[PDB]
Amino acid sequence: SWEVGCGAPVPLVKCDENSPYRTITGDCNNRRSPALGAANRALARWLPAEYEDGLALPFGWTQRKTRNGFRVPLAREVSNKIVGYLDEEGVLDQNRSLLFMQWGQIVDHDLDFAPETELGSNEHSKTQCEEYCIQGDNCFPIMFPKNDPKLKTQGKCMPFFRAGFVCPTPPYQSLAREQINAVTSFLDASLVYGSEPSLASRLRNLSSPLGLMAVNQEAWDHGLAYLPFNNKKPSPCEFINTTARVPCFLAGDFRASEQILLATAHTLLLREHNRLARELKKLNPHWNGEKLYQEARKILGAFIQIITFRDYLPIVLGSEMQKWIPPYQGYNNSVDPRISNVFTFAFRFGHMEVPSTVSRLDENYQPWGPEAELPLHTLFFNTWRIIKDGGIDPLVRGLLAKKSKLMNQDKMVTSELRNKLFQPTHKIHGFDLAAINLQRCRDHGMPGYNSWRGFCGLSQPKTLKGLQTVLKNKILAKKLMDLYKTPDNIDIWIGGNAEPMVERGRVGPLLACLLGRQFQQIRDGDRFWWENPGVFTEKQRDSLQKVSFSRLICDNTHITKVPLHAFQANNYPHDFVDCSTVDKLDLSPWASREN
């Protein structure tokens, strides 16, 4: 399309023509186009954006303006009528550990983040959006439908603020509006080390030459590290309990403390980095801080890619895995490794996988304490239940032994997220993640469900009956049709999650295609991929092929009984074996042998 590169905000950096290691910003990965897959640049467009005004106004912005002849429904109205459900019985995934949902949030956070525009921290329009519900520039409030119980209780709307865009923060208008991805498009552990120089540094231990990551010296997990606290007012985690006053954590990714299993998850990764750094020092006492950092970073990064691609994607993609992620044929520099704007909605399938409760389990994998089980909604931004209630160990067993939620067409998203989500600075366990995913689609000019059906070489239902056949569900298809008035108009997040799941997968056909390409691209387009010939040695690669998320766990907690296959539904003590029976990451090949 006639124009060739805008994107003022991001300084260049004369590349690491040098570096044996990725950069923090992801720059210089690709040699001919060094900004490709760099953080802080526009999300990629697989298809052209679709805005009401053709440029930036989201569909649903002007009441009088229709999409394909019809008003689009209110996001919260789609949510109540289709996404919500009462009965949590019969909802669990007989074949998926809770670590399965947790891994996905983590991989997601390594890959993408479209922050809301910061355009007002000394502005009452920062609170004006919430207090008065006035659609209002970067303010695009989710209005409640007439028969919504939150009307009687919370007001007229749920605040919501349009996502930040490249080039102008403010007004400009000639080409379509493009949202930003602020993390690196590479599975590079950016969630552990950060995607800005700025935050990479603050995360590091530069007080010692061991190449360690900063740890919290304010509190400890039985001799085991905790992420450092965050720096900073005003704070989600102190607020949800002003008595414990326990801050949100600090990691390479800002949503680290969104919920306690992710912080947990973040906590396992930090430990692996330091435990990688102390041990590489052992073998190589001659290496300096930096060499220790990057080399650990580097090993940590391969780790994320193997567990994701060998253990995780096949149970997401199932029968479509081969069809989109053929086995690896090496680095291809012609591939675009940028996260697409539709992937950040596609990967939101994880939302139907989150169950309503989280448990903590003691060494016999039995309820740890009197209130061992807790509703997810009280764990939003809850750092205290970790520092002051058991360390991460009990929660990691909850991750091995409990189950994820199963997508279900009549039970899409649990009220804990749909009704009780806490949004920082909106003080009420009372928002709607479904509604918000739906408003966000529109915010990002997402093409509709069929556009994506066509794009994936699948059919495009047009009638009620047509949709019934595709969803294989009459009722969901009526609801759907009475809301949107056509297949054409259905928001992608929800039409994509509404189709039944492929043989041995957890997403339907459309999603396996959307997700499938993207992952193909981030692996094929990565100059530092783990199996890219020449990144790791012969030895190292044979040594890397054995990592397991049951290893991380043993090497980094005081858990001694674990799964062999952590993503599947695992019951103790039957499916739990001793830590000693599991292949280690042998670092012998990392000996910087002679001088």
Ligand code: HEM
């Ligand atoms: C609370 C939240 C979760 C768990 C209890 C949770 C979980 C996941 C899973 C398991 C994901 C994939 C496997 C996943 C993907 C993405 N999410 Fe979600 N998520 C919780 C809460 C949120 C909130 C809040 C948002 C922001 C919504 C907005 O649009 O304002 C959110 C988003 C996303 C997202 C887009 C990330 C981006 O690129 O900006 C995923 C890819 N999630 N989550």
Ligand SMILES: *[C@@H]1O[C@H](CO)[C@@H](O[C@@H]2O[C@H](CO)[C@@H](O[C@H]3O[C@H](CO)[C@@H](O)[C@H](O)[C@@H]3O)[C@H](O)[C@H]2NC(C)=O)[C@H](O)[C@H]1NC(C)=O
């Ligand atoms: C905010 O976090 C507080 C902890 O930092 C938490 O208080 C703690 O929880 C209960 C009291 O409500 C107590 O835990 C157990 O132990 C005490 C003594 O050992 C027993 O007498 C109790 O029966 C209980 O089983 C802790 O004593 C208590 N700690 C403190 C400092 O009060 C609050 O509940 C949290 N509040 C919210 C709303 O999250």
Ligand SMILES: *[C@H]1O[C@H](CO)[C@@H](O[C@@H]2O[C@H](CO)[C@@H](O[C@H]3O[C@H](CO)[C@@H](O)[C@H](O)[C@@H]3O)[C@H](O)[C@H]2NC(C)=O)[C@H](O)[C@H]1NC(C)=O
């Ligand atoms: C549900 O959970 C499991 C997914 O984590 C699934 O495990 C794997 O299922 C597939 C398809 O049946 C098989 O895949 C494997 O088959 C060969 C056997 O020669 C393996 O060597 C390969 O690694 C390959 O991926 C496996 O049979 C199976 N896993 C293992 C370890 O072999 C379960 O079968 C599912 N169970 C139920 C009851 O739904």
Ligand SMILES: *[C@@H]1O[C@H](CO)[C@@H](O[C@@H]2O[C@H](CO)[C@@H](O)[C@H](O)[C@H]2NC(C)=O)[C@H](O)[C@H]1NC(C)=O
């Ligand atoms: C940076 O590195 C050093 C090495 O770990 C840390 O200093 C140690 O701190 C722990 C706990 O206080 C103890 O083992 C000793 O007090 C110190 N020992 C040594 C050998 O230095 C320091 O805490 C680290 N700093 C941060 C912020 O992570």
Ligand SMILES: *[C@@H]1O[C@H](CO)[C@@H](O[C@@H]2O[C@H](CO)[C@@H](O)[C@H](O)[C@H]2NC(C)=O)[C@H](O)[C@H]1NC(C)=O
């Ligand atoms: C690297 O990727 C590019 C595109 O992603 C591949 O170039 C393809 O070449 C075929 C010729 O048979 C052309 O039809 C297309 O221009 C390209 N195909 C696609 C899907 O874009 C190139 O082959 C890739 N290299 C390797 C080794 O896989």
Ligand SMILES: [Ca+2]
């Ligand atoms: Ca990344």
